[PDB]
Each structure stands twice: as C-alpha cells, then as structure tokens.
Ligand binder design. Structure first.
Ligand SMILES: [Mn+2]
Ligand SMILES: [Mn+2]
Ligand SMILES: [Mn+2]
Ligand SMILES: [Mn+2]
Length: 464
C-alpha cells in the first residue's frame, strides 16, 4: 500500500514508463516499480489477488474481457473532462458489460502500404485493383500481395460493405447478432475470391511471401501493420502508408487493437493508480517518455496523437482504426478465427460457393446459447462446521433457465464429486454432511429448457 507495481510487456518502452514513474515519485513520494515478466498475461490471473500481482497491468484490450469476466479488474471512474481527452472509439475497446475496465493507451490497425517508385498514386478503391494489376504484370510486377491465410488480414475487405463479427450496441456486445454471412460479407469475400480466381492474387500467399515480395520490389502494394515498418526500412523500398481502399464506396474495416491499462481489482492503491494513469502517463509528456523508448504507434490521447500524426504512416494508422472494427473482447470471438479461415480457404479454392462458405462460418460462430447466465461474486453466505449456504445471481439468467445443477467435491484431491439440482426459481442452496477442515470446490451450472446444461459455470473455493 506504500507503492505502485506496474506490469507491461518486455517489448514496450518500459524504461520510458519508469521515467514517468520517477516523476510521480518526485511529486508524491510513492515509489513506482515497472516490471516486465514474460508470459505476464498468463501470470496475471494467477497472482492478481493478492500476493505480488501488479496494481496496474498493460496489455492488448482483447485479454481484458477474460480478466473482467473473472472479476480481476476494477471499474474505472474517469470524469467527463478526462473522457473527452481520448478518441471516443477507443473507450469502446475497454468496456465489459457496459462498464469501463481500463484506460486506452495506443491503437493499432492494418493500413495499405505502397511502393512509391512503382505506384506514386495508390488506388482509392478495391475496384481499381484488377486494372492496376494488369498494367503491372505487363511490367513483370503485381499490384498487391498480402497474407491471405489469416482472417485478420482478409477481414478488412470482407467486412467493408457491412460485415461484422459481433454487433456492438449500447456499450455491449449482442452476442446473438453475428454479421459473418450477411450481404456485405458476401460481396466482400466474392470480390476477394474473384481477385484470386482471376490470378490477380495467389491463394497460397502468406505473411512471409507477401513481406518478401514487397521488400524485394516485386509488388506495388501490401497490407500490414505498424509492426512491419522497421522491416521495410531495412529494404530501402521508398514506401508510403495510407488509408485502405474503399469497397462499394465503403471503408475497409480492419480489426482495431488498443493497448490498455487496467487496475487490479484487489489493489489497495486504486486512487494512486488512477492519478498516475490520468495525470502522469496519459499526458503529452508521459506518452512521449514511453514513445522515445519504444514507439507506441498511434495513441488514444488526442493531443499527443495530433503531434504523432505529422508522420503520415501514423495518421493513416489512426484513420484506418477510426473506420475499423474494434476487436471484440468476448470469449465467443475465439470461434471466429478458425471458422472464417475455413470459409476463406474453401471459397478461394472453389470448394464452396461464397454463400455456403460464410453460412457454415456463421453457423459455427453462433453455436452458443440464446441467454445470459450467472457470473457471481462472493458466493458462500453462511456457514456451520459441517454445512454452508451458497448464493448466486440467478437474476442474471434469462427466463430460459429452468434449473441449476450444484456440484461439490474435494479441492485437488481427485475424489467423487457430489451433485444435486434446484429449480430455476432458486438463488441459494444449502450444502451439508461435510468434513470440518477441508477445501471444497463448489460449482453451479444453469440448465436451459431446450439445451439443458450450459457451458460457463460459476466455481469457487471454500473451507470449513
Ligand atoms: Mn526495450
Ligand atoms: Mn468479373
Ligand atoms: Mn533503411
Ligand atoms: Mn501537444
């Protein structure tokens, strides 16, 4: 409680961040320790409460969803004046169930990268690309090569004309609303597949081949993110970075990643963590200190971004991000990647129509129950030596839940798990006939009147 421990990845400007921490110590006498363990994103949930977990954790926003579901992150409380300092869209990356759970720091998205010596005026639309490729092939070059294997790289086009992963509305994901097979995703993927069948691109092109071709001066354009610029710099190609082309007049929709800073829910230093983040780090001066150490790319703080965007590669990054799709931070996004990978390979190879390929992907992604269930926090409400009463937020369940299955057994010790059921009108259960002295793992499942037992139970450890 005398201090602030910060975790940040070892490839980030943690020495710049330590300088900000030293200025904070100079103004407050609070010592700020910046650590950069490997695998920090796996370690955090294991050490958070309490021992030596950090007060503040910096990571891509997409992991913070899982942390928040687990109750590991404090709800943050920036005032209106602070909220206005960051681009509004970046705040949508750090909500979980409508509550703010982190501060946006930096923003990444794919851009169009072009060889100025081959193409001083890069295309404004995807539609111009076939004609440009024809004119370049007659000169032994291609217009465009980019990684086609990963949906992260093909999504910007697929989704441009109205596709989306999960609908985001009223500050939350509507997980039942997926936009993988709508008419927009179909137009996008049809255009992509047509480029490939017409030999404007090769269906086998992957990250390495695209990067090699561009850096060797063989292709006029590629699609890649800020992490690739220093590699291009070693090639001496005269390159530019610009807004992705439009499709059907609509912007490409790259996924947006936001490096974010979360405050540990178990931290006794939450107000100091807040002061540090809002009043020291998230200033022109604080972000510059980090950036000087290792560049952040585009940043969420408007004043400092205005300075950084004098580098048009950063201005392009931010513009592609403002037009893009925030990467969903919900667990159901896990199914997206392999589903869309399959769709794209099958459509591109001509194994399936675009329509059937995306319909199969949409099916595989929506695979998951209609309704909400229990997330719970602090379950055990009463105890005797041999008996305990548990409690869960049954009110969180949809009306489809008609029962709860309670399981309890020996913690660690691989023993017979006991189980019983209660009606869905019930929000508590007494467990009894237990040994006064051992660790128990109590777990509760929701039962749906159609699907039966649902997959995301609530589980706690207790001791009598
Ligand atoms: Mn470093
Ligand atoms: Mn045609
Ligand atoms: Mn160079
Ligand atoms: Mn400034």
């Amino acid at each position: 409680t005398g201090k602030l421990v910060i975790w940040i990845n070892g490839d980030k400007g943690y020495n710049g961040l330590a300088e900000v921490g030293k200025k904070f110590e100079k103004d407050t006498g609070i010592k700020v320790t910046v650590e950069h363990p490997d695998k920090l994103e796996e370690k955090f949930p294991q050490v958070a409460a309490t021992g030596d977990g950090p007060d503040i954790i910096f990571w891509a926003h997409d992991r913070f969803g899982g942390y928040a579901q687990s109750g590991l992150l404090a709800e943050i409380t920036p005032d209106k004046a602070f909220q206005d300092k960051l681009y509004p869209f970046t705040w949508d990356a750090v909500r979980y169930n409508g509550k703010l759970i982190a501060y946006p720091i930096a923003v990444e998205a794919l851009s169009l990268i072009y060889n100025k010596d081959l193409l001083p005026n890069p295309p404004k639309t995807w539609e111009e690309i076939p004609a440009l490729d024809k004119e370049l092939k007659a000169k032994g070059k291609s217009a465009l090569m980019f990684n086609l294997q990963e949906p992260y790289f093909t999504w910007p086009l697929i989704a441009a004309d109205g596709g989306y992963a999960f609908k985001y509305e009223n500050g939350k994901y509507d997980i039942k609303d997926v936009g993988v097979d709508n008419a927009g995703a179909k137009a996008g993927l049809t255009f992509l597949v047509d480029l490939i069948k017409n030999k404007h691109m090769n269906a086998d092109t992957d990250y390495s081949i695209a990067e090699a071709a561009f850096n060797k001066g063989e292709t006029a354009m590629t699609i890649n993110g800020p992490w690739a610029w220093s590699n291009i710099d070693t090639s001496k190609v005269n390159y530019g970075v610009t807004v992705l082309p439009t499709f059907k007049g609509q912007p490409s929709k790259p996924f947006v990643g936001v490096l974010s800073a979360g405050i540990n829910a178990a931290s006794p230093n939450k107000e100091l963590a807040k002061e540090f983040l809002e009043n020291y780090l998230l200033t022109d001066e604080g972000l510059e200190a980090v950036n000087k150490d290792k560049p952040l790319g585009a940043v969420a703080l408007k004043s400092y971004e205005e300075e950084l965007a004098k580098d048009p590669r950063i201005a392009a990054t931010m513009e592609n991000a403002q037009k893009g799709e925030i990467m969903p931070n919900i667990p159901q996004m896990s199914a997206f990647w392999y589903a869309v990978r399959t769709a794209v390979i099958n459509a591109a190879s001509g194994r399936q129509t675009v329509d059937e390929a995306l319909k199969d992907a949409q099916t595989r992604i929506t695979k998951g129950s209609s309704g909400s269930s229990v997330p719970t926090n602090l379950e055990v409400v009463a105890a005797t030596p041999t008996s305990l009463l548990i409690s869960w937020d049954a009110y969180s369940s949809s009306y489809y839940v008609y029962y709860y299955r309670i399981t309890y057994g020996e913690t660690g010790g691989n023993s017979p798990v006991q189980e019983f059921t209660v009606p869905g009108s019930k929000s508590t259960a007494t467990i009894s006939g237990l040994k006064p002295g051992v660790d128990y793992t109590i777990t509760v499942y929701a039962g749906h009147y159609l699907y039966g037992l649902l997959s995301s139970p609530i589980s706690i450890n207790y001791r009598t």
